[PDB]
Structure formats: C-alpha cells, structure tokens
Amino acid sequence: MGRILFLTTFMSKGNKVVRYLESLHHEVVICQEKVHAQSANLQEIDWIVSYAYGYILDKEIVSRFRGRIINLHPSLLPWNKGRDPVFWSVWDETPKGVTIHLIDEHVDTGDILVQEEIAFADEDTLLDCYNKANQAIEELFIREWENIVHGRIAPYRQTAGGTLHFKADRDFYKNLNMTTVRELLALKRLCAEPKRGEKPIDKTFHQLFEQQVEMTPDHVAVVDRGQSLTYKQLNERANQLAHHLRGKGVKPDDQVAIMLDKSLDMIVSILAVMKAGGAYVPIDPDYPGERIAYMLADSSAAILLTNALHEEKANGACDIIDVHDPDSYSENTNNLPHVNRPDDLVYVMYTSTGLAKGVMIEHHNLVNFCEWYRPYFGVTPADKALVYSSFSFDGSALDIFTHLLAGAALHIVPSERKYDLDALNDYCNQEGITISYLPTGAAEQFMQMDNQSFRVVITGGDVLKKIERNGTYKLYNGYGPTECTIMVTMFEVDKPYANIPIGKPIDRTRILILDEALALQPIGVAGELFIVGEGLGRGYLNRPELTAEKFIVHPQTGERMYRTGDRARFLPDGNIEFLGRLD
Structure with missing residues (x-):
C-alpha cells in the first residue's frame, strides 16, 4: 500500500509498531543514522514514522514530507520535550503520558495528533517506567494509525509552556536507572536545589x-x-x-x-x-x-x-x-x-x-x-x-x-x-x-x-x-x-x-x-x-x-x-x- 521510513536509534528493529505496519502490507525501511535529501532511504517514501530517533531531520526533509512525518514521543507534551522524557517526567514531577505528534522545525513542538495519560506506580523502577511508557505509546499508535493514514484526525497545537531537556542533562543522574520512583523522589528531596525565596545573609x-x-x-x-x-x-x-x-x-x-x-x-x-x-x-x-x-x-x-x-x-x-x-x-x-x-x-x-x-x-x-x-x-x-x-x-x-x-x-x-x-x-x-x-x-x-x-x-x-x-x-x-x-x-x-x-x-x-x-x-x-x-x-x-x-x-x-x-x-x-x- 505504501512505503514507510522508520527512523530510530534506541528502539529495536522488531517493535510492535514495525510489525503492525508490515502486517498492513507496508514495506518498512528501518534507518538508525542521520540522513540527507540524497539518501536512498528517502526514495519513494509515503510516511516517515520516528520513534526515539536521536537526530534532527534537515529542514529540507521536513518540508518535502510536511504533514507526513509522525513522531512517537513518550511524554505528555509540551511536558518533557527532548531526551530522557520519562525520567524527567518522574524527577520534575510533571504530568505523565505519551504523545503522537507532527514534526515542526523545532524539538517536539509540532501539533499533536493523539495523546493519552499514563500512570507510573510508586514502586516501579525508571526502567519499568521506560518500558511501560514505550508499550503504551506503541499500543496507541496501533490503535490510531488508521485514523492517521486517512487524515481524519484534527491536529491541535500544544498547550503553552512545558519543559525541555537535552542529551547531557541526565549525566549527573546516570546511576539512578534502577532506582524506584519512591527512592528517586526521596533523593530529590534530600539533594535537590534550594527552593525559591531565600535571600543572602545580610548580617555580621x-x-x-x-x-x-x-x-x-x-x-x-x-x-x-x-x-x-x-x-x-x-x-x-x-x-x-x-x-x-x-x-x-x-x-x-x-x-x-x-x-x-x-x-x-x-x-x-x-x-x-x-x-x-x-x-x-x-x-x-x-x-x-x-x-x-x-x-x-x-x-x-x-x-x-x-x-x-x-x-x-x-x-x-x-x-x-x-x-x-x-x-x-x-x-x-x-x-x-x-x-x-x-x-x-x-x-x-x-x-x-x-x-x-x-x-x-x-x-x-x-x-x-x-x-x-x-x-x-x-x-x-x-x-x-x-x-x-x-x-x-x-x-x-x-x-x-x-x-x-x-x-x-x-x-x-x-x-x-x-x-x-x-x-x-x-x-x-x-x-x-x-x-x-x-x-x-x-x-x-x-x-x-x-x-x-x-x-x-x-x-x-x-x-x-x-x-x-x-x-x-x-x-x-x-x-x-x-x-x-x-x-x-x-x-x-x-x-x-x-x-x-x-x-x-x-x-x-x-x-x-x-x-x-x-x-x-x-x-x-x-x-x-x-x-x-x-x-x-x-x-x-x-x-x-x-x-x-x-x-x-x-x-x-x-x-x-x-x-x-x-x-x-x-x-x-x-x-x-x-x-x-x-x-
């Protein structure tokens, strides 16, 4: 029916997403590198589906495929744009969810197609939260893909505000992957920066x-x-x-x-x-x-x-x-x-x-x-x-x-x-x-x-x-x-x-x-x-x-x-x- 380009760097090659699209008789091309306009990976492509893709598409590609680049981002946009969204969802204590959206010329700011809330248990590890989030968004994509193909979903602009995190923002927290939500929030309360309001000491x-x-x-x-x-x-x-x-x-x-x-x-x-x-x-x-x-x-x-x-x-x-x-x-x-x-x-x-x-x-x-x-x-x-x-x-x-x-x-x-x-x-x-x-x-x-x-x-x-x-x-x-x-x-x-x-x-x-x-x-x-x-x-x-x-x-x-x-x-x-x- 159509040739789909699947862009990812972290996800495997046999996700439920890829196999579901293949079951619908789509040839899914998988690519895990940064690509340019000349790339043979862009020849006769109908839809681009990105999922934890650690590179930025050139503005030349975003325009040619405007309205046909779909992204799976396991956060409740505009909350936790960028890298390590689920972790920052827990640490910064933001609303939790998963979002499928269009791609803008910026980082995860394009209009939303479908979105749903997710819940993490106080006992789940951040690895558990990472897996629960990816499963939830994948099931969502499978449920709503047909509505996205035929273009019957009305895209709505993201709520104002949110947060954004970059690749290196988690370096200081690298040892916390197997901690529990509880254990993690406790570490925040003990070691987190001082809250606003404090003033310098003004007396000798x-x-x-x-x-x-x-x-x-x-x-x-x-x-x-x-x-x-x-x-x-x-x-x-x-x-x-x-x-x-x-x-x-x-x-x-x-x-x-x-x-x-x-x-x-x-x-x-x-x-x-x-x-x-x-x-x-x-x-x-x-x-x-x-x-x-x-x-x-x-x-x-x-x-x-x-x-x-x-x-x-x-x-x-x-x-x-x-x-x-x-x-x-x-x-x-x-x-x-x-x-x-x-x-x-x-x-x-x-x-x-x-x-x-x-x-x-x-x-x-x-x-x-x-x-x-x-x-x-x-x-x-x-x-x-x-x-x-x-x-x-x-x-x-x-x-x-x-x-x-x-x-x-x-x-x-x-x-x-x-x-x-x-x-x-x-x-x-x-x-x-x-x-x-x-x-x-x-x-x-x-x-x-x-x-x-x-x-x-x-x-x-x-x-x-x-x-x-x-x-x-x-x-x-x-x-x-x-x-x-x-x-x-x-x-x-x-x-x-x-x-x-x-x-x-x-x-x-x-x-x-x-x-x-x-x-x-x-x-x-x-x-x-x-x-x-x-x-x-x-x-x-x-x-x-x-x-x-x-x-x-x-x-x-x-x-x-x-x-x-x-x-x-x-x-x-x-x-x-x-x-x-x-x-």
Whole structure:
C-alpha cells in the first residue's frame, strides 16, 4: 500500500509498531543514522514514522514530507520535550503520558495528533517506567494509525509552556536507572536545589552581638572563676579595645593574632578584633614554639594581642598590643561604625599529614551556624555554657559565638579542670551548666560522671561509640570539617547504634553523596561526602592550588562544593551515616 521510513536509534528493529505496519502490507525501511535529501532511504517514501530517533531531520526533509512525518514521543507534551522524557517526567514531577505528534522545525513542538495519560506506580523502577511508557505509546499508535493514514484526525497545537531537556542533562543522574520512583523522589528531596525565596545573609556577627547587648545588657555574658562581665560590660570593653585596633590600621579582611589563655581577656580580644573590622587568628600558647612561629608567618597578622607572659613566644614577629596595658584601651565605649560585609573574614584557624593549612572563615559562615544553633537547641538567656575547647580549634567558636547570640552566659574552663572531668562535673553541678560541646573523647568520659545540670551535650570529632550516660540530658552527635565552619550535620542520639549516624544537614547546607565521577548515588549507596551551601568558607590561606583541589566547581551542576574525603551514605530516614575515610 505504501512505503514507510522508520527512523530510530534506541528502539529495536522488531517493535510492535514495525510489525503492525508490515502486517498492513507496508514495506518498512528501518534507518538508525542521520540522513540527507540524497539518501536512498528517502526514495519513494509515503510516511516517515520516528520513534526515539536521536537526530534532527534537515529542514529540507521536513518540508518535502510536511504533514507526513509522525513522531512517537513518550511524554505528555509540551511536558518533557527532548531526551530522557520519562525520567524527567518522574524527577520534575510533571504530568505523565505519551504523545503522537507532527514534526515542526523545532524539538517536539509540532501539533499533536493523539495523546493519552499514563500512570507510573510508586514502586516501579525508571526502567519499568521506560518500558511501560514505550508499550503504551506503541499500543496507541496501533490503535490510531488508521485514523492517521486517512487524515481524519484534527491536529491541535500544544498547550503553552512545558519543559525541555537535552542529551547531557541526565549525566549527573546516570546511576539512578534502577532506582524506584519512591527512592528517586526521596533523593530529590534530600539533594535537590534550594527552593525559591531565600535571600543572602545580610548580617555580621558583631552586628548580631551588639543587637543582643541592647536586649539583655545586664545579663551575664562570660564568667571566669569569681569574675564576670555583663553583655554591656563586655561590649563596652570590647569597643574600647576595638577603637585602639582600628586606629593602628586594622581593616576588613586583615588578620589580627590573639595569643592568650582562656580568660575574660580572650572574649574581649576576640570581639574587639571583629568590631574593629578584621578577623582573629587564635594561637594556643601551649603549642610548640615552632608551630607558633609558623602560624604568625603564614598569617599576614601585623598585630598581636597577648600578655606580657606570652609576649616572648613570638620573638618580635609583630607589633604587640598588651591586653593589660590601659593604653591599649580607648576612652570611647560606643559601638564602632560598621564597615564589614557578611563575606569578610571573621577568623582563621589551622588544621594539620603535612603542614598546617590556614582555613579562612567568613562572617556569613559563622552567622548561619549560630542562627541555626539557637532555635535547634532552644537556647535562651537562662542557659549557661562551657568554653571548653582550645580557642585554636573551631569547637570554641561553638562555645563562644553560638551562646553569646542567644543571651546565655559563658563559663571559662581553666587548666586545672580541662582534663580532670570529675572536678569539671562538680563545677557544672554547682554553676548549673545547661549546654556545652565536648569532643568525642572527653564526651565519652563525662558519661561516667554523675551529672544533673546539663540539658544538652553535643559531641563530634572522632567516631562516637559510647552512649550510656548517668545524667538525664539529650545527647547529640554532629560532624563537619573546619573548612565548612564547625559542623554541617547534627543527630539527636535516641537509641544505641553499631554505627551512630551523624544526622541531617543544618540550615542552608546540603550534603551530596557522589561516586568517583561526581555523580549522584542512590539513597543507601556509599560514596564520597560533598558539602554544599552556606557552610563553605573561603578556602586555605595562601594555598590557592590546594583550595581548587578541595573546593571544586561541579562539572555538571557548577555549584561550589567541598571535597571532604570521607565515605558515607544516606539511610532510608534521611540521616547520614559515616563509613570511614576513603583512603
């Protein structure tokens, strides 16, 4: 009756479509390559029927066969034009269906001939959906072919709108072919881009702190032994030192070294550097003199805040400001004119397998963590927290910065009870300490101590393993590198686990579990843990090449991501599970 040209690249040679047409006594020429006008495949052809044909017909051919080029596209056009339609129908959660339509001079925009809705089960695999879709459209073609031949169908233009996808848009999702609709949509909710509406963080830390001072000015801010400062007292003293700092030339993104033991002078010095404009570089004086000399060298710090006691450990490296010389403090107690942006440096902390690298953290990094910490743990001015961790580690940033913006009171931990945790337990029961973060090592020990003051304890760092504790406080396990600011995930330990999970992401952060090719892994599959979002800092100071290696631009998405080097996987309940290092 007529010679039909069947164009396809993915479909086999014996589809129900081809065999049905042959049963109607049509010679079906099958071709799986791009063709031109001269092609012997176009000689004495009556109808062209395309079905998953991965090439574009020349405009010369579309005109000669106008009204005689039929296409089988397993989507509900205009939804999911282009490649991998069924997959994007599930992922983008569009209306699902199959369409037989005419061919325009563009991609799958020609007028429709016939169309019908299809349904995918929540348990079908995307391969199952691919097969159910192709079967449905093939049966439809067989049903409606006679109406198409005799030209009795009235073609209607496609609804406005839709979506379009190209061949490479699925590269990032290449490992998801055998996942279930359920499993796939869950992966979307966990790893999909942020929804519209969000705005950039617009506050620095000392902005939010100066705010908290005006709301609880007479509340206790920090306590060391018998002495204490209020928020107003702390703020005014920090201002007095900040004025002197900015006078000696401190400016945004400038580094200012602080070498002090835990004390009131430390909190004053930290806030003073911030309020002055710069970022503080903490140096624990108990470090070997070699690391100290190196930290001052790598850091561009021209100024060092320190005692007369530790003054000499610097060997005249920088202009020293004695925190005990009344000349280092101005008369002015007012808050300084703001000159900082959320993307300015707030602090620089080092980590060391090789040399120590200066991790740069910006205000917006710190602000995000604190603003998540307050409501997550329900912190209120009624609370009291320990300043336990060394102020050269990011754990101190948790102790100091989070609780200061909640209006709580900080309690300095001196040397005598840093390691003696039974004596520390007594201090907590006396002063009524309510919340604090202890590294995994020290947290496991405190479980043996009989405690009644704590309401929350947070741990992280090494692998948590012990859980049984005497007190009646909630235990929280968290995880995160100093490169992405303190922590990025948090778990409330409720029951014992052989492998305690590290929890779900905090505000404005996502965690992606990728393969070696940086492609998504289905939920439950192990892979390298990548961090994305507000937590990511600026990178390593004076290590641009190393920064590029660890702070990557993703090949497909193009989002900035941090390569942790850690092995993990998502559990069915959304909590992340640590699975050791990669090497």
